């Protein structure tokens, strides 16, 4: 379960296997014909990491249903066999079968979290083939959820039917790497928490290991000064950090925590900070925070969902330019490269699972018994929560877990589905951070089971777009009536989505849907209400940027609710928010 | 010698790209020796990337001088049993590389690779890797910067490019650590080929360091050995029966496996011939017609930085459009792109960094003492390094020595003759050489006529002259191109185009509209299609790209057939139709 980010250390190789791989669409016979046992014949070339759907100009490739095969050569030095050799897949979307020289090494379900496998040294030949089969199919058992049966026409080919509003980008989304550790004793996991009481900042550590050896830990400032250290330690302990500088939103500070175990060496960046919900306040380092930011997507052209590190950096620069302090990983865990950069840059993150589309009625009810047609995602939902927290537990930037986006939480049985998942997240997070689910707009919002479960109420609301469109006076009144209910509960609540589709270059001085001016007026109307509610502690727009979706009559070449275009150009509303967020402090707004 | 680093049974490959520390030089960075300690108060910058567009700061974008990149380098101690090498695929424009505060190497030239061994004794348990990067350009750099060439005093000193693309700088291409055996290893591989009936003879020269035995083997993609010679020394030749030739849009690559001592290296290799004969450009002895573009390495937000998903997209669009070729205007491109073009069957005109060798657009080629251009020495080095890097690529069919130098002025022949001689001496395959000719009133005095195997012309009939008078453009185009056609040698367009803002339209000829771009091209083809010696059309440009700011640059250069995010303008569809009806071979036979 433990999944430390692979790094080059004095004891660990790191070999990136990214590049140009061979690529072949399956036609239904690829497994039967055992394509993984030889070189792919009559194949294409496809960049890795990337989604495969938009690299070529083929609708057949973009809209493909089922499996594809990736393959590359793997000629490695024999001296590596003296170490433990691990193959790490940062993400393969959605499901994967991994083969070395025709031998199946591992399988994985879940397109947005890492997995790894040791390569048995008996399998390594002088020349090797690495084959990765990737499945794109979605249904009532996957996260995200695909629909099954939900002027009629018969489609030419079978297609996935996303139960979610983003394109089903698939492939080897994030890097594949070979890494090594010592064979006989190595570090398997590191858990760090912070204790700030009695005016003494301390780091508590727990170091999980394999084998028998001696453990040591040191904490170092940016400039390399050791501020605490001990040798021949226990598996758990605490270190006092004198003069500790706390990690703050938009003012990051990361210590370097160096761990040694036998010959193994591993360094973990770490920000010291506290998070707690108290009353109607979201407290970071005991100060009342106000979220300013966005729901995002991992979406760029042409790699789709694929890791784009230049654009990760551009995006954080744009958020700081705009005055934002935060974002949510809608609607799946993001790359570790993004998470580590957010730690370095001081961007606060709401870390969300892949659980979007858990809703069969947007008559079989979503949370009916599985044997009567109810949703089949709970078991996997548990695994995603475990794996997400295991990967991201040490990040200062992560302040809250989002268990699901827009599930059927006003329907019968939702509390029963979600209670074990909230209990699991609270059990597994060593920092005991707030947990939430992101609430769909529903007529019976007072019956939303988030009220019984969440530490913060996170609302997706479209007053002025999906209701009251082109009637913002009505939108304001409808917005106030509902948000006054939420405010009456005395707990922190926020917007995690609100927006209006906006095509750059469309304009009107008079309120008109899809124009840049209407996007601004939409936000002004909503803020007239939220700025008067003391328990409203955050605003995250939908969306940071325009992004790709499945095709249909209400998607103008994707979702156009971005403040920025897909190539990151600011609409009128992006300038509106730069001005607004320039006047709102990170702390003490309410 | 600069073989592309690969993972082999004898060679580790460790990519050091990622998030690096980054600091602008404030004028004290060398004096205060920032390279000896962790960079303080630093930003973060992705590597590989140009740094100019990552943030929102004009001071960063328009910075003049040096910046410092840095990262930690904690490497496994048992790599000290190997030879450890740091490869910089490209650092634009000049670099100083430090490990632990010791200067290990320096490099001039922003678009070709360089490397340095790390001395074992310098490696500590924890190491710092610092790269200082200089962006300054002048009369001694390639590309050339100007020096003195309602007036206003600028706020800050800035580079003055003598070229029409933005001066994107930084760690443009990946930084990697690799290893080879210490005692004996392969330094370079040179391959040439000759077709005798259906048997191909591959002549090899394998350069090595140390004492060991050399072996070469040739394998099909599927893995069948088709030739092998052992204990062969440095030079030799072998034969392949019924060889599959590499063809434009029908690539075929063999795998050439070399062993020397414990060292092992695999080189993909396509077999093909290139020859100019009469007015024909012959590939595998058939008259080729170039269909394609001048490109740039340009995407948002990495600028010039390696972008492998976009490289794959661009080739896909090229094949969608019916193109077969492009030119690496105006600098060598990434090895990753060049290796993909070998794999995909895209023909390349490989161009040096020599753009802006022109002081009168004092004479350009006056003596250095008298203020003439100071680039010839570095120009020779760029030619040497470019051919050393790319010599084995089947996709490279022609070398371009310079873009739009002052070749109609006195001294030009004297400047270029040693460079053409150098290129022909160093290329084992003896491929055609050209320079790319600037539009010029005295075109019959262009020294390309005395030097080049192919005359490659940049012409803007209907844009920079005869704008909005395409009937006059056609007449003036015909008058000049009938001269070039009378010389009997192959010639082509390497640039022709018209700035076009997507979304601007008119039914009636109007510059900057999508329709005018089409009519501009239709008018030029009316002439070129009638000219026997005209053997290729490469538009300017594949896609819109960033330039310096100015009154004629509508947020960069808009002559792309595609926008910067690779969307097709009307003229992109026009060329898809046109190239669908023109064969790669035998159009003008
Ligand atoms: C089951 N699948 C679906 C989903 C949605 C719709 C349909 N089928 S059908 C239809 C429709 N019709 C009404 C209009 N009629 C003509 O079409 C032009 C046009 O719609 O562009 C109109 O301007 C023109 O004046 C009309 O003569 C054409 C069909 N109109 C509207 N909204 C308005 N939505 C739909
Ligand atoms: C040394 N630096 C440079 C370079 C180029 C140019 C200048 N300085 S100055 C100037 C100029 N004048 C500027 C003032 N201008 C007025 O301003 C409007 C406008 O140009 O937008 C016109 O529409 C309006 O009718 C005129 O009253 C009328 C001409 N005009 C044009 N070409 C047209 N180019 C230039």
Q: How many CB atoms lie within 10 A of CB A157?
A: 8
- Distances in Å between the alpha carbon of A103 and those of A85, B32, B223, B423? 16, 56, 19, 49
Tokens 């995200």 belong to A144
A517 vs A514: CA distance, rounded Å: 9
B203 vs B239: CA distance, rounded Å: 9
| Element holding B315 (H helix, E strand) | helix B308-321
Measured from the alpha carbon of residue A152, the closest ligand is 1
Taking alpha carbons only, the member of B575, B432, B428 closest to residue B496 is: B575
A440 vs A447: CA distance, rounded Å: 12
- Distances in Å between the alpha carbon of A440 and those of A443, A536, B358? 10, 17, 64
Q: Evaluate whether A23 touches A35 at the Cβ level (below 8 Å).
A: no
Give the gyration radius of chain B's Cα atoms: 24
Q: Evaluate whether A232 touches A216 at the Cβ level (below 8 Å).
A: yes
- Six-digit token pair at B107? 């490099």
A489 vs B475: CA distance, rounded Å: 80
Taking alpha carbons only, the member of A131, A85, A129 closest to residue A106 is: A131
Work out the end-to-end distance of chain A between its first and last CA atoms, rounded to an integer number of angstroms: 40
- Six-digit token pair at B417? 């003759």
CA angle B406–B408–B414, rounded 5-degree value: 75
Measured from the alpha carbon of residue B152, the closest ligand is 2
The alpha carbon of residue B147 is apart from the nearest alpha carbon of chain A, in Å, by: 32
Neighbour-count burial of B270, counting CB atoms closer than 10 A to its CB (0-12 exposed, 13-18 middle, 19+ buried):
buried
- Determine whether B495 is an active site residue: yes
Q: From start to end of A44-160, where are the E strands?
A: 44-48, 67-73, 84-89, 95-100, 103-109, 115-118, 129-135
- State the greatest distance between any 2 C-alpha atoms of chain A, in Å, as a whole number: 74
Q: How many CB atoms lie within 10 A of CB A302?
A: 24
Q: Evaluate whether B473 touches B521 at the Cβ level (below 8 Å).
A: no
Q: Which residue of A has its CA nearest to B311?
A: A47
Taking alpha carbons only, the member of B277, B278, B259, B275 closest to residue B267 is: B259
Q: From start to end of A224-263, where are the E strands?
A: 226-231, 236-240, 255-261
CA of residue B550 to ligand 2 center, whole Å: 14
Q: Evaluate whether B554 touches B509 at the Cβ level (below 8 Å).
A: no
Q: Evaluate whether B351 touches B403 at the Cβ level (below 8 Å).
A: yes
3-state class (DSSP) for residue B578? helix
Taking alpha carbons only, the member of A549, A439, A555 closest to residue A496 is: A439
3-state class (DSSP) for residue B60? helix
Q: How many angstroms from the chain centroid is the CA of residue B403?
A: 12
A452 vs A447: CA distance, rounded Å: 10
Residues ≥6 apart with Cβ < 8 Å to A520: A572, A573, A576
B560 vs A207: CA distance, rounded Å: 56
- Six-digit token pair at B382? 């760029």
A220 vs A218: CA distance, rounded Å: 7
Tokens 């609708």 belong to A59
Residues ≥6 apart with Cβ < 8 Å to B166: B52, B303, B545, B546, B547, B548, B556
Q: Evaluate whether A369 touches A399 at the Cβ level (below 8 Å).
A: no
B75 vs B100: CA distance, rounded Å: 13
- Distances in Å between the alpha carbon of B449 and those of B290, B353, B435? 20, 21, 10
A444 vs A466: CA distance, rounded Å: 16
Do residue B54 and residue A567 have CB atoms under 8 angstroms apart? no
Q: Can you give B23-47 as a three-state secondary structure string?
A: EECCCCCCCCCHHHCCCCCCEEEEE
Residues ≥6 apart with Cβ < 8 Å to A519: A499, A500, A502, A571, A572, A573
- Distances in Å between the alpha carbon of B185 and those of B15, B120, B264, B335? 21, 17, 8, 21
A458 vs B168: CA distance, rounded Å: 43
- Six-digit token pair at A564? 């920025």
The two beta strands, B396-403 and B433-437, are parallel
A436 vs A453: CA distance, rounded Å: 7
Q: Evaluate whether B300 touches B333 at the Cβ level (below 8 Å).
A: no
B180 vs B85: CA distance, rounded Å: 8
Taking alpha carbons only, the member of A106, A172, A109 closest to residue A139 is: A109
The two beta strands, A264-270 and A275-278, are unpaired
A126 close to B (CB below 8 A): yes
- Six-digit token pair at A53? 């759907």
Contacts of A267 in chain B (CB under 8 A): 74
- Six-digit token pair at A88? 């790490």
DSSP B220-233: -TT--EEEEE-S--
Work out the end-to-end distance of chain B between its first and last CA atoms, rounded to an integer number of angstroms: 40
* Angle, helices A378-392/A414-428, rounded to nearest 10 degrees: 20
A106 vs A115: CA distance, rounded Å: 9
- Six-digit token pair at A122? 């008996």
Residues ≥6 apart with Cβ < 8 Å to B475: none
A365 vs A411: CA distance, rounded Å: 8
Q: From start to end of B270-395, where are the E strands?
A: 274-277, 280-283, 286-287, 290-294, 325-327, 347-351
The two beta strands, B18-24 and B433-437, are unpaired
Taking alpha carbons only, the member of B87, B139, B138, B88 closest to residue B110 is: B88
Q: How many CB atoms lie within 10 A of CB A232?
A: 7
The alpha carbon of residue B124 is apart from the nearest alpha carbon of chain A, in Å, by: 10
Do residue A223 and residue B37 have CB atoms under 8 angstroms apart? yes
B232 vs A363: CA distance, rounded Å: 78
Residues ≥6 apart with Cβ < 8 Å to B479: none
Q: Evaluate whether A69 touches A131 at the Cβ level (below 8 Å).
A: yes
The alpha carbon of residue A247 is apart from the nearest alpha carbon of chain B, in Å, by: 16
CATH domain B275-580 topology: TIM Barrel (3.20.20)
Taking alpha carbons only, the member of B215, B234, B233 closest to residue B225 is: B215
The two beta strands, A348-352 and A398-405, are parallel
Given A248, A336, A352, A497, the catalytic residue = A497
| Element holding A479 (H helix, E strand) | helix A472-488
Do residue B19 and residue A223 have CB atoms under 8 angstroms apart? no
> Strands across the sheet with A115-118, in order?
A14-16, A176-181, A84-89, A115-118
CATH number for domain A276-583, candidates 3.20.20.80, 3.40.50.450, 2.60.120.10, 3.60.15.10 = 3.20.20.80
B568 vs B565: CA distance, rounded Å: 9
- Six-digit token pair at A139? 């249904």
Task: Quickly list H helices, A58-172.
Answer: 59-62
Tokens 């475990």 belong to A386
Contacts of A323 in chain B (CB under 8 A): none
Taking alpha carbons only, the member of B531, B431, B516, B518 closest to residue B480 is: B531
- State the greatest distance between any 2 C-alpha atoms of chain B, in Å, as a whole number: 73
Taking alpha carbons only, the member of B90, B84, B86 closest to residue B133 is: B90
Taking alpha carbons only, the member of A461, A437, A448 closest to residue A526 is: A461
- Six-digit token pair at A423? 């209990």
A402 vs A437: CA distance, rounded Å: 5
3-state class (DSSP) for residue B209? strand
Residues ≥6 apart with Cβ < 8 Å to B262: B10, B181, B183, B184, B212
Q: Which of A8, A302, A311 lies closest to B301 in CB terms?
A: A311
3-state class (DSSP) for residue A380? helix
Taking alpha carbons only, the member of B176, B114, B133, B125 closest to residue B21 is: B133
Q: Evaluate whether A36 touches A130 at the Cβ level (below 8 Å).
A: no
Q: Evaluate whether A28 touches A20 at the Cβ level (below 8 Å).
A: no
DSSP B368-432: GGGT----HHHHHHHHHHHHHHHTT-TTEEEEEEEES--TTSTTHHHHHHHHHHHHHHH-TT---
A193 vs A197: CA distance, rounded Å: 13
Do residue B300 and residue A41 have CB atoms under 8 angstroms apart? no
B410 vs B446: CA distance, rounded Å: 10
The two beta strands, B274-277 and B325-327, are unpaired
3-state class (DSSP) for residue A449? coil
Q: How many CB atoms lie within 10 A of CB B81?
A: 12
CA of residue A556 to ligand 1 center, whole Å: 17
Do residue A318 and residue B45 have CB atoms under 8 angstroms apart? no
Q: How many CB atoms lie within 10 A of CB B127?
A: 16
Q: Which residues pair with A19 in a beta bridge?
A: A48
Q: How many CB atoms lie within 10 A of CB A533?
A: 17
Q: How many CB atoms lie within 10 A of CB A476?
A: 18
CA of residue A117 to ligand 1 center, whole Å: 54
Mutation target among A174, A186, A302 for the B interface, most CBs of B within 10 A: A302
- Six-digit token pair at B346? 């895209």
Q: Evaluate whether B459 touches B495 at the Cβ level (below 8 Å).
A: yes
Residues ≥6 apart with Cβ < 8 Å to A506: A512, A514, A515, A516
Q: How many angstroms from the chain centroid is the CA of residue B442?
A: 29
- Six-digit token pair at A230? 């001990």
- Six-digit token pair at B112? 């070709």
B520 vs B515: CA distance, rounded Å: 9
* Angle, helices B376-390/B412-426, rounded to nearest 10 degrees: 20
Taking alpha carbons only, the member of B280, B284, B262 closest to residue B271 is: B284
- Taking the CA atoms of B134, B137, B138 and B140 in sequence, report the sign of the dihedral they define: positive
Do residue B55 and residue A317 have CB atoms under 8 angstroms apart? yes
Q: Evaluate whether A327 touches A296 at the Cβ level (below 8 Å).
A: yes
Burial string for A167-179 (b: 16+ CB within 10 Å, else e) reads: bbbbbbbbbbbbb
- Six-digit token pair at B3? 């073989």
Q: How many CB atoms lie within 10 A of CB A286?
A: 13
Residues 294-323 in B contacting A (C-alpha not used; CB under 8 Å): 300-302, 305, 307-313, 316-317, 320
> Strands across the sheet with A226-231, in order?
A226-231, A215-220, A255-261, A264-270
3-state class (DSSP) for residue A12? strand
CA of residue B466 to ligand 2 center, whole Å: 22
Q: Evaluate whether A563 touches A541 at the Cβ level (below 8 Å).
A: yes
Tokens 């009636």 belong to B508
Give the resolution to one decimal, in Å.
Answer: 1.8
Q: Which residues pair with A70 in a beta bridge?
A: A23, A132
- Distances in Å between the alpha carbon of A110 and those of A107, A157, A335? 10, 25, 14
Q: Evaluate whether B19 touches A340 at the Cβ level (below 8 Å).
A: yes
A181 vs B333: CA distance, rounded Å: 36
Tokens 């009107």 belong to A508
Q: Evaluate whether A424 touches A401 at the Cβ level (below 8 Å).
A: no
- Six-digit token pair at A17? 């296997």
DSSP A311-371: HHHHHHHHHHHHT--EEE-TTSPPPHHHHHHHHHHT-EEEEE-S-B---S-----TTS-GG
A496 vs A484: CA distance, rounded Å: 17
B151 close to A (CB below 8 A): no
- Six-digit token pair at B395? 């996709």
């Amino acid at each position: 379960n433990a999944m430390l980010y692979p790094i080059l250390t004095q004891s660990r190789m790191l070999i990136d296997l990214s590049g140009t791989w061979r690529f072949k669409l399956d036609d239904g016979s690829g497994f039967e014909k055992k394509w993984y046992e030889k070189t792919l014949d009559d194949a294409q070339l496809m960049p890795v990491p990337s989604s495969y759907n938009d690299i070529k100009e083929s609708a057949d490739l973009r809209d493909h249903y089922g499996w594809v095969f990736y393959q590359r050569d793997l000629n490695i030095p024999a001296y590596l066999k003296t170490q433990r050799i691990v193959l790490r897949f940062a993400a393969v979307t959605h499901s994967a079968k991994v083969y070395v020289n025709g031998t199946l090494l591992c399988e994985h379900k879940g397109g947005f979290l890492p997995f790894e496998t040791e390569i048995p040294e008996n399998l390594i030949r002088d020349e090797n083939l690495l084959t990765v089969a990737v499945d794109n199919r979605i249904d009532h058992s996957t996260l995200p959820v695909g629909r099954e049966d939900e002027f009629p026409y018969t489609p030419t080919k079978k297609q996935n039917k996303p139960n979610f509003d983003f394109f089903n980008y698939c492939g080897i989304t994030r890097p594949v790497k070979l890494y090594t550790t010592p064979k006989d004793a190595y570090i398997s996991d590191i858990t760090l928490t912070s204790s700030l009481e009695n005016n003494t900042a301390r780091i508590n550590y727990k170091i999980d290991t394999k084998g028998s050896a001696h453990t040591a830990i040191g904490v170092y400032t940016k400039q390399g000064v050791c501020v605490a250290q001990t040798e021949n330690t226990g598996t758990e302990g605490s270190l006092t950090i004198e003069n500790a500088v706390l990690w703050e939103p938009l003012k990051p500070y990361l210590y370097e925590v160096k761990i040694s175990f036998g010959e193994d060496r591993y360094t973990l960046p770490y920000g010291i900070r506290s998070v707690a919900v108290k009353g109607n306040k979201f407290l970071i380092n005991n100060k009342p925070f106000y979220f300013k930011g966005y729901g995002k997507h991992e979406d760029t052209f042409p790699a789709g969902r694929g890791l784009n590190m230049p654009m990760n950096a551009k995006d954080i620069s744009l958020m700081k330019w705009q005055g934002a302090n935060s974002f949510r990983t809608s609607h799946y865990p993001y790359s570790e490269e993004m998470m580590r950069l957010c730690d370095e840059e001081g961007i606060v993150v709401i870390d969300e699972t892949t659980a979007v589309g858990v809703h069969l009625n947007f008559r079989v009810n979503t949370f009916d018994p599985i044997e009567q047609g109810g949703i089949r995602t709970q078991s996997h939902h548990k695994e995603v929560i475990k794996d997400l927290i295991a990967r991201d537990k040490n990040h200062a930037c992560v302040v809250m877990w989002s268990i699901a986006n827009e599930a059927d939480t006003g329907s019968k049985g939702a509390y029963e589905y979600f209670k074990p998942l909230f209990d699991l997240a609270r059990e597994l997070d060593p920092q005991k951070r707030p947990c939430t689910l992101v609430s769909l707009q529903m007529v019976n919002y007072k019956e939303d089971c988030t009220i019984k479960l969440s530490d913060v109420f996170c609302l997706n609301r479209y007053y002025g777009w999906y209701t009251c469109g082109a009637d913002l006076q009505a939108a304001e009144k409808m917005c106030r009536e509902e948000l006054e209910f939420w405010n009456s509960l005395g707990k922190p609540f926020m917007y995690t989505e609100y927006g209006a589709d906006t095509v750059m270059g469309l304009h009107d001085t008079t309120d008109s849907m899809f124009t840049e001016e209407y996007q601004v007026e939409y936000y002004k109307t909503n803020h007239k209400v939220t700025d008067t509610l003391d328990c409203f502690i955050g605003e995250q727009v939908w969306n940071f940027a325009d992004f790709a979706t499945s095709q249909g009559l209400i998607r103008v070449q994707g979702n156009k609710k971005g403040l920025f275009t897909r190539d990151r150009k600011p609409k009128l509303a992006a300038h509106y928010f730069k001005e607004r967020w320039s006047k709102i402090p990170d702390f003490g707004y309410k």
